Design a binder for this molecule. Sequence first.
Ligand SMILES: OC[C@H]1O[C@@H](O[C@H]2[C@H](O)[C@@H](O)[C@H](O)O[C@@H]2CO)[C@H](O)[C@@H](O)[C@@H]1O
Ligand SMILES: *[C@@H]1O[C@H](CO)[C@@H](O)[C@H](O)[C@H]1NC(C)=O
Ligand SMILES: *[C@@H]1O[C@H](CO)[C@@H](O)[C@H](O)[C@H]1NC(C)=O
Ligand SMILES: *[C@@H]1O[C@H](CO)[C@@H](O)[C@H](O)[C@H]1NC(C)=O
Ligand SMILES: *[C@@H]1O[C@H](CO)[C@@H](O)[C@H](O)[C@H]1NC(C)=O
Ligand SMILES: *[C@@H]1O[C@H](CO)[C@@H](O)[C@H](O)[C@H]1NC(C)=O
Lengths: 334, 333
Amino acid sequence: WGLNNAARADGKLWFGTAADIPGLEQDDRYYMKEYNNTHDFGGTTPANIMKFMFTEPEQNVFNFTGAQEFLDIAFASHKLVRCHNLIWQSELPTWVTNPTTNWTNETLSKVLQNHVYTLVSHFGDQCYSWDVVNEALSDDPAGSYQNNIWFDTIGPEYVAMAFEYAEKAVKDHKLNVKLYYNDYNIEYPGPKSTAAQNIVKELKARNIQIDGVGLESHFIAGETPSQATQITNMADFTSLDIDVAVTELDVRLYLPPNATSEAQQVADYYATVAACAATERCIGITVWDFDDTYSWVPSTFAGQGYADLFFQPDGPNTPLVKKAAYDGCLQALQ
Amino acid sequence: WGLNNAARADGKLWFGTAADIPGLEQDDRYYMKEYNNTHDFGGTTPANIMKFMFTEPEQNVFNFTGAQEFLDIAFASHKLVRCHNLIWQSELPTWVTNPTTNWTNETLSKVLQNHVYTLVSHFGDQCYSWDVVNEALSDDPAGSYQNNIWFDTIGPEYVAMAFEYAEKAVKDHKLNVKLYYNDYNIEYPGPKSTAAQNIVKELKARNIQIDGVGLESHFIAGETPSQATQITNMADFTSLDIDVAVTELDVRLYLPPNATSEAQQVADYYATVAACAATERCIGITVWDFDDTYSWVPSTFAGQGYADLFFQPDGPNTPLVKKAAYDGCLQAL
Ligand SMILES: OC[C@H]1O[C@@H](O[C@H]2[C@H](O)[C@@H](O)[C@H](O)O[C@@H]2CO)[C@H](O)[C@@H](O)[C@@H]1O
Ligand SMILES: *[C@@H]1O[C@H](CO)[C@@H](O)[C@H](O)[C@H]1NC(C)=O
Ligand SMILES: *[C@@H]1O[C@H](CO)[C@@H](O)[C@H](O)[C@H]1NC(C)=O
Ligand SMILES: *[C@@H]1O[C@H](CO)[C@@H](O)[C@H](O)[C@H]1NC(C)=O
Ligand SMILES: *[C@@H]1O[C@H](CO)[C@@H](O)[C@H](O)[C@H]1NC(C)=O
Ligand SMILES: *[C@@H]1O[C@H](CO)[C@@H](O)[C@H](O)[C@H]1NC(C)=O
């Protein structure tokens, strides 16, 4: 009995994990045995291979092969897939970021439209959902739109546009895929969360399909919003007639860990999972990978790490050790 | 003079250990030096390589190579082998769990029949025994059958079927292989143990061969059933005209160990081994690996470990340290 059995028993669609597949993880038999364990993981998200630079490496030249290897692997484990992501400021190829000739509203809008419509149409119902727009909102000022190539060139309309063209692809191919907005620092009430709720409201008012909001939940031990804080934040979204999901959960510490900060981690994993469990329309929890060995964290937040449910004290391709954080998740579901 | 010498002096067939071989353990010279120590280990069980996903990775395409590698390594240090296992709910290949079309009773039964019969036939008397069915019984409610792809599709009959088709193989090819049922939480009196006894009674009544029950004996320090409790429970099984074996013994603790929990561990290893020693038709004790470094425990139970007879304080590829638990086993014998 594991996290995914427990989550499905609580009415959730999955307990899930991201994985950086295709990749070195596939060469680690101890990692893969646990990835493939449907007791723990009934959902998954590709960490990288469906992002824009990998799927459209040159303008109008699509590459689906790595993404399809990921989907094939997921399917063999009966995992529902959160496809991630269509439009984001990061991991953009050079033809977008540094074009020989400058984009116009017209020309970049067409690039966005073609990228969205082709990826959604191509993969169809292999995806349970798409993260159609990722991280459109600023941290400063918190309410406002992020400055990025899409925003700067198209304006705020690029968000509605992305959902509109993803909707066109689902309608044109009679798909069931759900359309999500995904962001971080929207897991607690505040101007950024409110701004995300206003995106949902605006789309709904325009009869543009939007099914859910992804709450990334990249947290630091001790800074994580309380379970109660997450409960009321989740309710604010779901009252807009959408689902939510916890999409990228990990709870990083300042290295090295100690007894206090490990105890904080367990509490913060518990709080986030418990808040999902208390929320009728939170459809599931996904961790942003489950093995510290392969976690994005220590590359991205210097002097932080230890963020995942398992680790390998002897490195890649050696046995896993389950952390107390895992039990925090399981208890939250029971 | 080691555990296996002592067990054999007491009328047992072995003291044994599982090993996850082929694998990482083969690259640890201090691990393999002890594995190959026949003074301690005269029996072994493959932790993974003889399971369904490895031996029939696609339907009616068998792969025996890994298993044969295990058997060859075992033969080199004169070990008797508990081959493990034929039918089990877990560790099944995606051609069985994620079929192109739905299994029915008929089509799955033939999958079962074919797996069991070809593995038993193929390996013949390289195996002392097969765990023909593993873990058929539920914990909740304890009495009952476990829901799995075999039971859901084929019904309770899948158990008698597996043994029937194993018996066919032994009869066809004139084998000595013993046929075991193997399970956990049946090491003490209660509904699950009584249910496993009922399986044996049912098979015997229908003249299906069943030679033993394997008592996994994955215990927690201080929760292990007393020696006396194990002695009765073992007698309840052996009175049905079968053998028993202690098949997967380990005694895990909540980390870190302390003087009290380590003393409990020694007492619990002693109790289990001593119960087998007391029991004429308990044929041997196998531990579920012998080196903490490679134990299954830490990947499965958060905050637990230290379950085995040896550990390596300096990590993989460094010398083993023999724990007090080892002397508990020896003294029991
Ligand atoms: O906010 C954090 C960020 O995580 C992203 O995932 C990736 C990361 O972008 C990439 O460099 C690294 O190599 O892989 C990790 C996972 O292995 C995610 O796409 C974003 O939504 C999120 O913002
Ligand atoms: C995990 O599943 C994938 C997809 O079937 C497979 O390629 C891989 O070998 C599996 N690894 C395990 C079970 O260790
Ligand atoms: C397509 O992607 C695959 C794997 O990600 C890569 O090997 C190949 O070179 C890419 N480009 C192509 C096929 O043009
Ligand atoms: C645990 O780590 C945290 C974060 O670095 C620190 O604030 C705290 O003092 C540490 N406690 C110890 C070392 O006992
Ligand atoms: C253990 O025996 C096996 C099988 O003969 C052999 O391959 C291995 O080298 C041995 N290792 C030792 C004795 O350290
Ligand atoms: C030893 O460990 C056990 C189990 O965790 C615990 O109950 C007991 O209090 C510990 N005794 C000590 C530290 O002396």
